[PDB]
Amino acid sequence: NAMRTFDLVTGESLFVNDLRVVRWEQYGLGTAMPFQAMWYSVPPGDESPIDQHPELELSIVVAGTAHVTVGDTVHEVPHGNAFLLNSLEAHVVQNRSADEVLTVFSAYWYPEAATAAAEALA
Amino acid sequence: NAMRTFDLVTGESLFVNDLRVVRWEQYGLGTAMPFQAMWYSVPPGDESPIDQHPELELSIVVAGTAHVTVGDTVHEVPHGNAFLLNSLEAHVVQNRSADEVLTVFSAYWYPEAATAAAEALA
Ligand code: NI
Ligand code: NI
């Protein structure tokens, strides 16, 4: 129970259009983590269907470059950089590269979970 | 409010020996996330000082390859994969590459914080 390794390539995946999504529910972590998580990969020139949800979402780009449209704003997020989406903000994630796959790790959580956590730190 | 980005290269840094650590305390996120976070980078042929803490720690390998020693056992975690350290497991992170920098994004939380979170969604 000391450490677990999680592999983007060997995990079970589903496809949203052509985006490969690896959801962490498959790993049966239960409540050990105060959030849910996934990897997703976007083919070159592709983009995610518009997404909107009460959970905040923190994303780290582990390969390629993301162009994230939130409202009337495009944010460019290169490999290594991160972005945080506030609750219920609609968003589209775009891979404008012609040859490089965009892969992202996302953690996401309901606002109540985060405030319940921090009050325990009090 | 809607959307924030975070930059690995320009974030404020401190050094633990020769490891560059970018702590997310500097972004003033307060209570929005149910965990703390950081990037750290390990130079080639270097390793972290032995670390042990009550927080669980989820680490994504953003660049390079990690060799994680937990207790007596070495685990290799290539680019893009994740590892999860259980509470109070002593760990050392080595970069055995001759030339490629290892960069890791880590999120960490106390067990009580994850208990208090999920009991709020009950
Ligand atoms: Ni989303
Ligand atoms: Ni640690």
From TrEMBL, chains A, B:
Pfam families, alphabetized: Cupin_2
Superkingdom field: Bacteria
InterPro entries xrefs: Cupin_2, RmlC-like_jellyroll, RmlC_Cupin_sf
Range of residues in the leader sequence: none
Residue ranges constituting the Cupin type-2 domain according to the UniProt record: 39-101
The protein's name: Cupin 2 conserved barrel domain protein
